[PDB]
Design a protein around this ligand. Structure first.
Ligand SMILES: CC(C)NC(=O)[C@H]1CC[C@@H](n2/c(=N/C(=O)c3ccc(F)cc3)[nH]c3ccc(CN4CCC(C(C)(C)O)CC4)cc32)CC1
Length: 308
């Protein structure tokens, strides 16, 4: 049992209901086995694990060497993810906070993060039809569905970006889900690290956030998706992007991007928040793109390399 989690005992409210550490589902430590590291994420290394044939999970761990504020951050992360209920948001199996190091147990996303996926699964001479337009539109729909759920529930994400989206598996039938809430977590509990390149004009100027903030960011996510994992605003630094965007500058279409898809991006990037579509409208426009043969029959560019 943690001293400062129990000393502070923060409440978390979502959708008009309040929760605390006692609502989290504590899984006995003896039921949890770590299998392998999966890379660096929230709070450091994320691990593949199994609970109690067993349940496969991703495990975030809290470093035993950490501040009181890191502890509170970890608790709040558990509270936030445990209260969401949507198929396009990673599930929380539970927590193990009463042994050290402390764990949060999450849905295992075998496909990894979307940015790395797009970069590694780009069409190439060795894998010429590794992805098609419809694969990209399905990822877009999946994430817009998760964002619509957050909007409906008045939760502002603030960091919708390909790096924070995960895939259930690499192969066909993959489902994309929002897999990080670290920015929202920090804001709930209270610059060279802000995600400037995903932020609308009114964000870094006035510090005003609404769900139309997430709409802007979703537009940038769409560019990330249809570019196959390029960094937004190629060649521009954070301050160059800030000045560019606040003066009306917008990204060009990604290579081979169909016009109807690019038009969704440019609507998401309307200077005035009121002119930006909500996620219901974004979903309708993604569906229309998905039904249009000229969109879905467009070939993605082949990135040059060897046959092996
Ligand atoms: C900020 C957060 C979204 N990112 C992370 O936590 C990172 C660290 C874990 C990492 N990850 C990972 N994370 C999670 O499952 C996870 C992370 C956070 C959660 F809240 C929930 C689940 N699962 C992973 C499974 C595999 C792999 C390895 N990858 C599989 C696909 C493969 C291909 C097909 C592209 O060639 C390349 C190698 C990585 C996995 C995702 C990125």
């Amino acid at each position: 049992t943690s001293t400062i989690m129990t000393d502070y005992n923060p409440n978390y409210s979502f959708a008009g209901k309040t929760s605390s550490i006692s609502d989290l589902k504590e899984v006995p430590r003896k039921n949890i086995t770590l299998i392998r590291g999966l890379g660096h994420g929230a709070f450091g290394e994320v691990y593949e694990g199994q609970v109690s044939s067993p349940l496969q999970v991703a495990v975030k761990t809290l470093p035993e060497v950490c501040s009181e504020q890191d502890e509170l951050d970890f608790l709040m992360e558990a509270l936030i993810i445990s209260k969401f209920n949507h198929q396009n948001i990673v599930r929380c199996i539970g927590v193990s906070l009463q042994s050290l190091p402390r764990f949060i147990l999450l849905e295992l996303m075998a496909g990894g993060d979307l940015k790395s996926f797009l970069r590694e699964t780009r069409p190439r001479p060795s894998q010429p039809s590794s992805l098609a337009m419809l694969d990209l539109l399905h990822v877009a729909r999946d994430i817009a569905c998760g964002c619509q759920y957050l909007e409906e529930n008045h939760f502002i994400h603030r960091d919708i970006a390909a790096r924070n989206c995960l895939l259930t598996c690499p192969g066909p039938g993959r489902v994309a889900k929002i897999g990080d809430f670290g920015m929202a977590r920090d804001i709930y509990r209270a610059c060279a690290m802000l995600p400037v390149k995903w932020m609308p004009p009114e964000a870094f100027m006035e510090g005003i956030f609404t769900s139309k903030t997430d709409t802007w960011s979703f537009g940038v996510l769409l560019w990330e998706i249809f570019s196959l994992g390029y960094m937004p605003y190629p060649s521009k630094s954070n301050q160059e992007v800030l000045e560019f965007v606040t003066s009306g500058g917008r990204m060009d279409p990604p290579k081979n991007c169909p016009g109807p898809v690019y038009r969704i991006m440019t609507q998401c990037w309307q200077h005035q928040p009121e002119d930006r579509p909500n996620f219901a409208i974004i979903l309708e426009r993604i569906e229309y793109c998905t039904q249009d043969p000229d969109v879905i029959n467009t070939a993605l560019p082949i990135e040059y390399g060897p046959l092996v």
